[PDB]
Design a protein around this nucleic acid. Structure first.
Ligand SMILES: *O[C@H]1[C@@H](O)[C@H](n2cnc3c(=O)[nH]c(N)nc32)O[C@@H]1COP(=O)(O)OP(=O)(O)OP(=O)(O)O
Lengths: 334, 923
RNA sequence: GAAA
DNA sequence: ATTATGCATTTCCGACAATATCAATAC
DNA sequence: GTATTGATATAAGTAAAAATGCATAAT
């Protein structure tokens, strides 16, 4: 009952700002079946969904035709994309707003100021049953926005004050590889540590078979991602894209100290711990040598460590009496 | 034993000369003590403090800095000794390769011989002093940068060896890699040794915990997704280093002299008696040093010597009254005038809840960063004032001298960097002349005009200025009687300390009945208005420029900045017809300060963002808008650029000619130098920099090049540094953007030096701040005459034409690059010759081969044998056929062109002599 | 901070 | 062949301005 | 095997893209 934009229509658009979009209804059906959101959300007719950077809107139209949610909203401020969305989706229950998803004040002015989109707050013992958010951040310069949203998962402030809001995001292949790297892998970084600490992420689909070697073979076997060619994404000059599902989880550490410890430890990501604690302050090496009795810990590199080991280290850092000030970690540039 | 009071008390000229001779004989040992070097002075001071502490029982915290430094030196010297022994053992054999650890010994084989030359205690003290000097530098909150510290320590060790070698002389340079390795090795050894004692509180016990912690630690930080190796200093050391014993801990090495400076007779002789200083300040350039040595050999720089000697021969002393007022203000503790105010530690607003708005969290982080930056800036600005006041205390009531140097352009600066008369208003008000000359019949008028100028009313006629000064007599009296605990009228001036000194002198004059016979020491300033624009007008013969920069005599002094501000306000009134709100907000908000900076900088080649920042910096205090006023500043820049483009024409013409000449020089290749193969293809190296000479014979070489930043493996880390000891292609944009300002500044410096030399010949006391010249109040008329005559003599010739002739002579045989389409018959001939010459050579002849053939053909005509010359003329090369053509500049393949410079713009017929009576040329 |  | 594209007036005072890890090559 | 120059990632609001300040060079 909702029109689905076609390849000829979406091909008339001039600028996509580096964002690749998908237009194949068959692979949309495949990925929706793989996700199996019908069981997670017991009342799809009572489901409120927020869409960020929709672009073509084909995914939103197929989502509506498949589930019939209680409310769906598209946030798109780019000129031609919004114009095409209004032209193709007017006269339908889908709603399009001329707002830019990057601004932090946009969500406040949309939720508690203008009183348009209000999610349902529930307990943290289960995934948010009446709130779903969908995003498409494929622009290669917009990885900072993804990391900011992960930090917002950590702080429970941006959209996670509502609960365990399930995330569905299209990201570039490199970003997914970096976020889904296991201990010991060459691509593991602080983004991987944040992903392991805050979320539970799965690779629902990818756009290139040759890029799967960046992921762990065991994780690939468990996930069973859906693969499709690059001919199904309209702007064909871009790198392959991937789809992930992020489920926020519970944690029992302090975010500021953990962030400081991980950031200053993973700078030297191939150096054993018996020579990197000197970078955490004055006397750090002797203090941590005295306070740590484990054997392989003093020889493991921080790329070999995991979230539990990092939490142990940050708890020791808290217990340090002579610890440095976390706040005074910046430069006097401007 | 005060000497200035005795000198003033002596009533006879012969007795004054006798006392001056006695003082000069007596001050030699004091000069030797002052010029005693840093390593020896620091070592003796630290050992003395340690001995005194050992004598007085056990007192640690009182002299903690010096006691700790001596302890560290004593317990860290053996590490350096053992490393030197290890290096000797690993170099004495000199037999095996791939010996030891790959990272360890291959580095030692590199930095070994550079460590065995200098004394181990000497490197110890050098490292300690450098690391104490470079604190809170580079944006690091409480420490230095590793890249900075390794170079500074290594460079200091290199410099101390040069002094030791030359001292024994009564080896060229060290590589940057070696400097970095030495610095890293020694800083690591100091880190391993430096221990401080601090007490903290246990989080779970809430009681004090005792222990010893390293003083220095090596860590990394981030700024916009990029690493930053840093070195930190513990708070227990910061609190003492930023204290009032910093002068005792780090003794200065370039202080004002007590005896008359050694005259300049050679490019490496002059200034201090025991310290060797080069005439020029060459940051990193061997070409400038080579050209300076060649000029010194030729002997074409002697007026430069005369001017610098006149500048350095003037005696100074410390103003006791202003010093006492400054000391009272400083000891009070409250922030007064521009002294910020002594605060101990930071104050931070309470953090919001963690689950608050991300915008709120970002705002809080921004506020914290701003507060920390302000606190650090205030602490630095207070430490600088403390250092200057301690030097003033040291040299109180004593004769002073300030030997001068030059920078690569030619402008003159004192050798002493800490306390001199180029500082801020406090430093300029803390210094007076040693010789006190009678005021005569004009000193009163000139001193009153000086005070009126120091109150910012330096755009009024002289009658108005003296009327202002004589109307404010009661305020002058009150300010000079009780500066503090009074009406504080002198603080309203834009130069408060100088106004205070002038008020002291004026009251001391007014207390008598015969002001003519008063003895004054206060220097009086006379500076030109829009000096760069004046020089541009003189260069271009611009009658309009001359009449608007006060060159043409007039009753009232003009102000180009006020004129431009008024014109732009009229333009905004015009735009009020459209009445856009952005224009309406700033229509009447124009200020002559903003217009002044923009108009001054425009003739030097300023860009849109530069003008935007210049306008915004001075528009912030007006607070017309938020920090997003950059839109308002950009509109301001647009219309002020339109106005200045309308106004200034001949100056921009000369600027364009200079820029075009710089481009032609930067895109040129030498014949003999670049005849060798480069194996880069059709892209020959550009090794030519814009060089010219001042009318005084000083050669100026532009040092702009391209910097290659590569990581160097040091002990602490791998620093990201460049090599300024290697030849690199010249930065064309830098040369083109630097020539127009450098030429004008060189002209300014030459005129200042001419005036200084003539005033020295005429027996006056001369001091200068670039475009501003100081002297006694009674010698101002003679000084004005000297300046006018020197300016007329300097600009009597066509300086731009002489520069063009010099460029043509120095670039006789040079090759440019040009692309012309083969559609033209002439341009296709070059392509045919290139094909024909390739077949003749038997291979694919390149641009390098063609240039080499042209250079070799020229050598034939330059050969003494006519037969070779006849063959050379008979032989036609690629560039030879293009010598006659001078119109193909605008008429595809790249072809070689000769170096021809643009024609000089027409110069208006303006007689520069007419300024010999212009009252407001300098004021 | 100082000068164009 | 117009598209990207680095840079934004000069000088001096300590007056600045990234480092680690890896991935094929070269020897 | 050891040794070497180049490519790539880091953090994460003072966006990136598109549309400009602007000249110079380029993929
Ligand atoms: O007022 C200045 C000054 O006290 C100090 N400061 C900043 N840079 C320097 C410097 O190179 N040398 C010295 N001796 N002192 C310095 O910090 C204060 C803050 O200066 P701002 O950043 O506000 O202004 P800046 O000098 O950068 O202005 P400009 O020269 O770019 O116009």
């Amino acid at each position: 009952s909702v029109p689905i934009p076609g390849i000829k229509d979406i091909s008339k658009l001039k600028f996509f700002y580096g964002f690749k979009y998908l237009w194949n209804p068959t692979v949309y059906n495949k990925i929706f079946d793989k996700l199996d959101l019908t069981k997670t959300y017991k009342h799809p007719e009572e489901l409120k969904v927020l869409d960020l950077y929709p672009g073509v809107g084909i995914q939103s139209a197929i989502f509506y035709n498949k589930y019939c949610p209680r409310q769906y909203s598209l946030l798109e401020k780019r000129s031609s994309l919004y114009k095409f969305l209004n032209a193709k989706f007017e006269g339908s229950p889908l709603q399009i707003l001329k707002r830019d998803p990057y601004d932090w004040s946009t969500y406040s002015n949309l939720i508690d100021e203008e009183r348009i989109f209000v999610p349902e707050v529930q307990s943290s013992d289960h995934i948010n049953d009446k709130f779903l958010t969908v995003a498409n951040v494929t622009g290669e310069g917009s990885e900072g926005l993804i990391m900011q949203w992960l930090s917002c998962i950590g702080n429970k402030n941006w959209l996670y004050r509502f609960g365990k809001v399930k995330m569905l995001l299209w990201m570039p292949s490199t970003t997914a590889r970096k976020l889904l790297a296991r201990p010991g892998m060459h691509s593991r970084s602080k983004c991987s540590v944040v992903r392991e600490a805050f979320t539970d992420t799965k690779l629902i689909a990818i756009s290139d078979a040759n890029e799967l070697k960046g992921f762990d073979s065991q994780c690939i076997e468990e996930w069973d991602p859906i693969l499709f060619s690059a001919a199904e994404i309209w702007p064909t000059k871009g790198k392959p894209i991937a789809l992930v599902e992020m489920d926020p989880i519970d944690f029992d550490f302090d975010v500021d100290n953990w962030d400081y410890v991980t950031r200053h430890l993973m700078i030297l990501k191939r150096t054993p711990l018996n020579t990197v604690m000197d970078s955490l302050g004055h006397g750090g090496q002797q203090y941590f040598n005295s306070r740590i009795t484990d054997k392989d810990l003093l020889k493991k590199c921080p790329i070999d460590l995991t979230n539990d080991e990092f939490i142990y280290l940050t708890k020791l850092f808290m217990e340090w009496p002579f610890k440095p000030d976390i706040l005074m970690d910046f430069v006097d540039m401007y | 034993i005060n000497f200035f009071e005795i000198y003033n008390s002596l009533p006879t000229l012969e007795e004054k000369k006798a006392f001056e001779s006695a003082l000069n004989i007596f001050n030699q040992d004091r000069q030797k003590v002052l010029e005693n070097r840093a390593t020896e002075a620091a070592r003796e001071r630290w050992k003395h403090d340690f001995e005194e502490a050992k004598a007085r029982g056990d007192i640690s915290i009182e002299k903690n800095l010096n006691v700790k430094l001596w302890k560290w030196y004593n317990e860290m010297l053996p590490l350096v000794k053992e490393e030197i022994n290890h290096c000797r053992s690993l170099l004495s054999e000199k037999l095996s390769d791939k010996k030891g650890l790959n990272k360890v010994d291959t580095n030692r084989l590199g930095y070994g011989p550079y460590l065995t030359l200098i004394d181990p205690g000497k490197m110890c003290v050098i490292t300690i002093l450098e690391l104490l000097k470079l604190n809170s530098t580079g944006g690091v909150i409480e420490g230095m940068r590793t890249a900075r510290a390794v170079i500074s320590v290594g460079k200091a060790i290199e410099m101390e060896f040069r002094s030791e070698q030359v001292l024994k002389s009564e080896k060229i340079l060290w590589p940057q890699s070696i400097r970095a390795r030495i610095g890293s090795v020694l800083i690591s050894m100091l880190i391993q040794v430096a221990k401080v004692s601090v007490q903290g509180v246990d989080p779970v016990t809430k009681a004090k915990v005792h222990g010893e912690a390293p003083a220095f630690a090596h860590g990394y930080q981030y700024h916009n997704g990029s690493k930053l190796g840093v070195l930190k200093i513990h708070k227990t050391l910061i609190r003492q280093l930023n204290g009032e014993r910093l002068i005792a801990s780090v003794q200065p090495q370039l202080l004002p002299m007590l005896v008359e400076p050694k005259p300049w007779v050679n490019w490496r002789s002059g200034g201090y008696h025991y310290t060797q200083s080069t005439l020029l300040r060459t940051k990193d350039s061997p070409e400038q040093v080579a050209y300076l040595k060649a000029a010194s050999d030729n002997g074409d720089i002697d007026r430069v010597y005369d001017g610098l000697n006149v500048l350095g021969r003037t005696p100074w002393t410390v103003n006791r009254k202003v010093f006492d007022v400054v000391s009272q203000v400083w000891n009070k503790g409250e922030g007064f005038l521009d002294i910020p105010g002594a605060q101990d530690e930071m104050v931070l607003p309470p953090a919001p809840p963690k689950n608050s708005d991300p915008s709120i969290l970002r705002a809080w982080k921004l506020q914290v960063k701003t507060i920390a930056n302000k606190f650090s800036s205030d602490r630095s600005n207070r430490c600088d004032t403390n250092y200057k006041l301690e030097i003033a205390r040291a040299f109180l009531g004593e004769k002073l001298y300030f030997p001068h140097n030059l920078d690569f352009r030619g402008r003159a600066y004192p050798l002493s960097p800490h306390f001199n008369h180029l500082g801020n208003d406090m430093s300029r008000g803390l210094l007076i002349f040693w010789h006190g000359k009678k005021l005569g019949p004009s000193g009163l008028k000139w001193l009153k005009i000086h005070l009126s100028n120091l109150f910012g009313f330096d755009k009024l006629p002289l009658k108005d200025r003296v009327a202002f000064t004589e109307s404010h007599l009661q305020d002058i009296k009150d300010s000079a009687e009780n500066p503090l605990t009074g009406d504080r009228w002198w603080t309203t001036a834009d130069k408060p300390w100088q106004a205070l000194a002038t008020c002291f002198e004026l009251n001391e004059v007014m207390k008598m009945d015969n002001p003519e016979e008063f003895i004054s020491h206060q220097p009086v300033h006379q500076d030109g208005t829009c000096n760069g624009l004046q020089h541009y007008a003189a260069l271009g013969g611009d009658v309009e420029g001359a009449t608007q920069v006060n060159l043409v005599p007039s009753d009232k002094p003009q102000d180009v900045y006020a004129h431009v501000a008024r014109l732009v306000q009229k333009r905004l009134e015009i735009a009020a017809e459209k009445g856009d709100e952005n224009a309406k907000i700033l229509k009447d908000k124009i200020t002559r300060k903003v217009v002044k900076q923009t108009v001054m900088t425009n003739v030097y080649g300023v860009t849109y963002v530069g003008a935007t920042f210049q306008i915004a910096k001075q528009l912030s205090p007006i607070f017309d808008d938020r920090k997003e006023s950059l839109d308002f500043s950009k509109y301001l820049t647009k219309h002020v650029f339109s106005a200045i483009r309308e106004l200034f024409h001949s100056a921009h013409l000369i600027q364009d000619w200079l820029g075009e000449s710089a481009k032609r020089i930067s895109k040129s290749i030498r014949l003999d130098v670049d005849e060798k193969s480069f194996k880069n293809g059709n892209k020959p190296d550009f090794m030519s920099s814009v060089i010219w000479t001042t009318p005084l014979g000083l050669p100026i070489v532009q040092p702009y090049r391209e910097e290659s930043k590569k990581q160097v493996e040091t002990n602490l880390q791998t620093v990201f540094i460049s090599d300024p000891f290697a030849v690199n292609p010249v930065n064309a944009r830098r040369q083109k953007a630097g020539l127009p300002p450098n030429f004008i500044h060189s002209l300014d410096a030459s005129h200042m030096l001419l005036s200084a030399a003539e005033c020295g010949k005429q027996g006056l006391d001369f001091a200068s701040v670039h475009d501003s010249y100081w002297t006694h109040a009674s010698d101002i008329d003679t000084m004005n005459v000297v300046l006018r005559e020197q300016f007329i003599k300097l600009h009597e010739v066509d300086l731009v034409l002489r520069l063009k002739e010099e460029f043509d002579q120095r670039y006789k045989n040079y090759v440019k690059i040009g692309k012309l389409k083969r559609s033209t018959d002439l341009a296709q001939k070059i392509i045919r010759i290139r094909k024909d010459l390739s077949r003749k050579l038997g291979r694919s002849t390149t641009l390098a081969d063609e240039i080499y053939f042209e250079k070799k053909r020229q050598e034939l005509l330059n050969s003494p044998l006519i037969e070779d010359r006849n063959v050379g003329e008979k032989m036609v090369t690629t560039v030879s056929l293009f010598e006659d053509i001078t119109d193909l500049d605008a008429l595809g393949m790249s072809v070689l062109l000769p170096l021809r410079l643009p024609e000089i713009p027409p110069k208006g017929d303006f007689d520069v002599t007419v300024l010999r009576n212009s009252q407001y040329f300098f004021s």
